[PDB]
Symmetry: D2
Subunit: 237 residues, 4 copies
């Protein structure tokens, strides 16, 4: 199956698979059972920002999720991604709903990756920035229920015409180009991802969450991965 590294914004506690009993952010290394979590004060109907960073010096994957004028949540985990991911990856956003639901609306997404060669000390870099999504966004691979262009946003999961989120939905968007995320012959490598999101639910319990993820290039939504599996994992192992 696929190889996944992800930062999850998990709106729904699935205590049966080791979620904490509160909405949380997590670092997922090849499992939906986060290697590290932090409590997250998700604000229903508010636009939030997620920031994810990693470099090959510290080998610490860190995320910050925040809303304007509120305290941020942060989670960090030490991991050598050279030992986890393939050298070449795709990067993407994923989201799901299950019995309970929410909008999984992405208003912006940026990514930057850099590799400096040990042999020449010259740098290879990729950067993309989406502040608006068009109805035909040819540099995004849309999987499952994901759609673009509705008010210039990326709707990862199904929403009705009047903005009501639907249950049992999963969708993802991957950047078209493969990304060279590590190289043994690189002296320094880094990436950063940022996205803005709007999670809104009429349900007393919103579900299930949004994730930024890094995968094998040919990654697809695993069969059955609605709800707690966030469109990333084939099972809850």
């Amino acid at each position: 199956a696929d190889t996944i590294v992800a930062v999850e914004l998990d709106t729904y506690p699935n205590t049966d698979i080791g979620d904490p009993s509160y909405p949380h952010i997590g670092i997922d290394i090849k499992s939906v059972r986060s290697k590290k979590t932090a409590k997250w004060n998700m604000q229903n109907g508010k636009v939030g920002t997620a920031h994810i960073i990693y470099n090959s010096v510290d080998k610490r994957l860190s995320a910050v999720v925040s809303y304007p004028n509120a305290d941020s949540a942060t989670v960090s985990y030490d991991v050598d991604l050279d030992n986890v991911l393939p050298e070449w990856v795709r990067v993407g956003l994923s989201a799901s709903t299950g019995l309970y639901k929410e909008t999984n609306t992405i208003l912006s997404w940026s990514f930057t990756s850099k590799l400096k060669s040990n042999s020449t000390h010259e740098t290879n870099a990729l950067h993309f920035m989406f502040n608006q999504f068009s109805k035909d966004q040819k540099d995004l691979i849309l999987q499952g229920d994901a759609t673009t262009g509705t008010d210039g946003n990326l709707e990862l999961t199904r929403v009705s015409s009047n903005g009501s989120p639907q249950g049992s939905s999963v969708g993802r968007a991957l950047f078209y180009a493969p990304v060279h995320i590590w190289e043994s012959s690189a002296v320094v490598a880094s990436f950063e991802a940022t996205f803005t999101f709007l999670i809104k639910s009429p349900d007393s319990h919103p579900a299930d969450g949004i994730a930024f993820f890094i995968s094998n290039i040919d990654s697809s939504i695993p069969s059955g991965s609605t709800g707690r599996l966030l469109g990333l994992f084939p099972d809850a192992n």
Copy 2:
């Protein structure tokens, strides 16, 4: 056929298809017969730099080609690319040889494109920078004789084991992601490309040249486009 906009670095005068009688840089709009040329003092065996710029305000495609401590060649042409290219494109480098030959070696390639929306005044951007090419460069589409990784360079046309360039060769490299090069609903848009190149010919007269090009996403090398057609055009019309 494909739709091509290109900046040619033409090392071989084909006077029978309207080339000037000297090595030259040109702007090619849907024809190998340049809309505009400038004289180019190509320096056999020296690393040079090409810089290509366009924005939606001036709608003037401009190029500068130079070698360190020499005077540059510059060519400009007014063209509304909204009336020539599809909205979504790929960008690439092309080169060819014919009965005369040369190395068509690319040492670096960078590209930046930006679109600012009329409705939100927010910007979408893409940037890539290759200062080294690997043996398996998954974010490049290699066509024809193009190879990567030989001394960390992109060799657009065939070079033998003994290092000598081959005749009748054509090759191209395209960036994997489609590029949104214009949008009627963009208030301002721009792109810039830069590459560094090394053209070496032992065989007296070098041929045929290198081009930076913008094409339909599904562009392929036209069959028989060796020599004066520079891997870009199916004929000399």
Copy 3:
């Protein structure tokens, strides 16, 4: 006197010094009497965006001023800045009021300048981006009535405690670092500036405007340059 190149967003027609009879954008080369103008449909109380671009290949100074979901105004003028400005400059924003008034509020300002050496083909670059201004913004030189930090904005001209703009006010903000805007030994050079602005007038007719300008490093507000002189020029010559 100082040496000024500016893009004016002129909200008040001064027909006695050669303004057109409508609010307009202009290119000012060493005179308040614009070398080129375009009609500008200024929208009282709306946030707008100005984009200014120049490169050493085309030597065409261009500006686009627009509001979301409205048609832009654009103005261009061919000028070799090597023959007008000193090699080293400061860049700034200026605004004024006179017997008529307006808020001259700056919400964001970004600037990028690049110089590529003819001898090495290596690039020197400067970039700054202000999306918020603090009460003590040590990388800005504030002149005249300019203040920062009020709602995170840069107020170029005086606004009273009750929020109403004052007449006969002039103020400017310059970036602290000198900028190398041209070099004879540069093979390619460029700059771009962007700012967002909010011009509000209760007093019927708004005056006088905002300008982006480039000056000698030691530029100061010319004494008496309120009203039609836009904080840039000592007289209307």
Copy 4:
């Protein structure tokens, strides 16, 4: 006195002030006695690269120093710079010689700093890149013996016409603009610095080293700070 945070490339063991008995890289927090060091295989006469990184999420200052095709040295130290530096700083390079000497030649210097506001989630950024230094580099403050333009390089300490380094020399270069390095109201902040250097000595023991530093804006070379104090500290406390 001044407040200094520095990354030292220390070529000369001063065991009397707690240097290790080998050339080393160090993190200096308000003292020449490094809070952390790593062994450094300095290569006399070779061009090296230094990379320094910090962000407000991890609050870990890290450096990597390397030469092409050799193993890098890395040093990291956990420090909350909000508790060390003033909010506004200058950034610079410093170097010294004493009884023993070396060239302290800087071939390139880049710096990037970003602050994201907790209230708006908008970013303020500064970036500069010097790949060549001119004889009159108006955006650098040169202190002590530092000179620019000799072969397009920054010579931090004194060198003769034939390239022979001089003893008892100290010099620094600071970027002209103040830098907003931390803000309590910033949700995420980062900086990165890179420079390339050429340390060459005819002496069996080269001395004394190069440092990247962050200081109070009005920082000057302390009296007597040649040799082991690297132009940064007034004493060896």
